[PDB]
Design a binder for this molecule. Structure first.
Ligand code: A3P
Ligand code: A3P
Lengths: 9, 297, 298, 9
């Protein structure tokens, strides 16, 4: 996916 | 202060930020708050933690900061920009309420910053046994950029670091403004827990917080996204099913090295060599809820 | 909303956005605008292009837009958050002025979106001969994400794609809202250029626009970052030295293939087979400025 | 540490 379920640093 | 009884959103607003490492009861917590008629949290915005990470990133990076400061884009300008972006998103992504709330797990890595930006905000830091949180993300494939789901060791190491930061931030914010909420205590003792939480928040009791599942899809109630990974758990009343499903699924080498991989376990009151800890005794209310869940209500 | 005289700012204010491919006279342009008493642009913010790229990516992903929509984070919410963020940065990072301006070169890849966020904003798209911009970035080592500074061929190819997009955006926004400004014509003819520019912007003529070098560091004047790459050029009056200096420094194979490498040159009126083109003749005003620079006044 | 004069284009 272009973006995961979550992220931060 | 801009339009949303006509509530105004502004930086001095009463706000609640809920967070924690994903798979720690954050959706349950926010849904229980949503059940209250004076509070709206709503769905994860996804974008708030991205702008925070962006903000937090180049303060260490010497070169970016120097360039920003020389451009007149100082802390004061950035902070003003961040406040405005965040308020717009929190205010406009759901229904208005007297007390607005945001739940995005990783925002709690920035509670010291958020507390400064929003001087009347409060924080609920969800704490769950890291073995339960890790087993959840691995078995359900809930993806976190930077966490390797093919490894219990990796996920536990990264859980540990994540909660170490969030807890340190919660302690710095202080007892008046940030409350650790333990998932297992929330589940075992919902009434006692919510009473303590609502007191901390300065918000009066409502039985509705103990019947969140009845307010799903309803006005002033609990709005759930069908794509969010916790939705099919949160449609059920508070129940005991997820407390210790992890037991027995941790690789032996990781079980051996548990206190060293995850020193935050013991620091938060979880015995790293109990498989599982005795989290406590369930209230009859949650025993009953669990029985209703099992029969298939 | 208010900047400390009492200036208001908001969504509907007539913002000026300056940009183009870097090394195209964008700092010169915004500096001449800063010299105007009613206008403030100030330094490159960096954070505006960054947040625009982030927001673009969020809607570009089908799945991510679906997730955001399901969260109540719709185009309308995102756009409101973007407007408020972008205005805070523009309003607060420099001195207050009646007319607010921003120069971050690659924001002009987003002029359609920006014009929608800010319905009274206008755009100045700096256009310079790509051979001059590319020679500039390579010889000075101005780093641009994805450009390989060891290759004129690569940098011209990427200049070409970048200006292709910005120029299409400019055309889409329309002649009322975006004006291409030719750097070589600004330099040769700054009086006439600024006359046309100020008129397009609906701002009254001021002579100070032709004297930006006297307003560096001054209140209501031109604020420069000491670490931006154009600063040591911009502290001088408009002068002729940089127009054609690229000529003879382009690898022979690239000169040969110029028309294939950078078809945007011909589209913009730069003859790709002239080394260099005749850009024109300078006003006495610029000849005199150039002479003062060579005498070491700056 | 991907610091560049222009980071988004
Ligand atoms: N009604 C309910 N009762 C008990 N736990 C619940 C619940 N609804 C959600 N949870 C728990 O919250 C966890 C996810 O937390 P988060 O929302 O922060 O990702 C899930 O753990 P499991 O995946 O182990 O079941 C889930 O079961
Ligand atoms: N006072 C002035 N007169 C003429 N050109 C100028 C100028 N100040 C800056 N420029 C030109 O603007 C170019 C940089 O553009 P930008 O600000 O968009 O990066 C530089 O080109 P060179 O590097 O070829 O000298 C610079 O010489």
């Amino acid at each position: 996916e272009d973006f995961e379920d979550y992220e931060f640093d | 202060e801009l339009v949303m009884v006509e509530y105004r959103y502004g930086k001095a607003m009463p706000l609640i930020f809920v967070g924690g490492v994903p798979r720690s009861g954050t959706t349950l917590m926010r849904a229980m708050l949503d059940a209250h008629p004076e509070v709206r949290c709503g769905e994860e915005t996804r974008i708030i933690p991205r702008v925070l990470a962006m903000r937090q990133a180049w303060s260490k990076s010497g070169r970016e900061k120097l360039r920003l400061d020389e451009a007149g884009v100082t802390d004061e300008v950035l902070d003003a920009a961040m406040q405005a972006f965040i308020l717009e998103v929190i205010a406009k992504h759901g229904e208005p309420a007297r007390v607005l709330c945001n739940k995005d797990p990783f925002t709690l890595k920035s509670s010291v910053y958020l507390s400064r930006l929003f001087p009347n905000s409060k924080f609920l830091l969800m704490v769950r046994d890291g073995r339960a949180s890790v087993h959840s993300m691995i078995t359900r494939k809930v993806t976190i950029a930077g966490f390797d789901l093919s490894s219990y060791r990796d996920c536990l190491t990264k859980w540990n670091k994540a909660i170490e930061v969030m807890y340190a931030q919660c302690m710095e914010v202080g007892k008046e403004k940030c409350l650790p909420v333990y998932y297992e205590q929330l589940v075992l003792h919902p009434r006692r827990s919510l009473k303590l939480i609502l007191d901390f928040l300065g918000i009066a009791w409502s039985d509705a917080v103990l019947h969140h599942e009845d307010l799903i899809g309803k006005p002033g109630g609990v709005s759930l996204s069908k794509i969010e990974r916790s939705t099919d758990q949160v449609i059920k009343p508070v129940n005991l099913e997820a407390l210790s499903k992890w037991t027995g699924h941790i690789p032996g080498d990781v079980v051996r090295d548990m206190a060293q991989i995850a020193p935050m376990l013991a620091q938060l009151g979880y015995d790293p060599y109990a498989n599982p800890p005795n989290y406590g005794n369930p209230d009859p209310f949650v025993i009953n809820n669990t029985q209703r869940v099992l029969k298939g209500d």
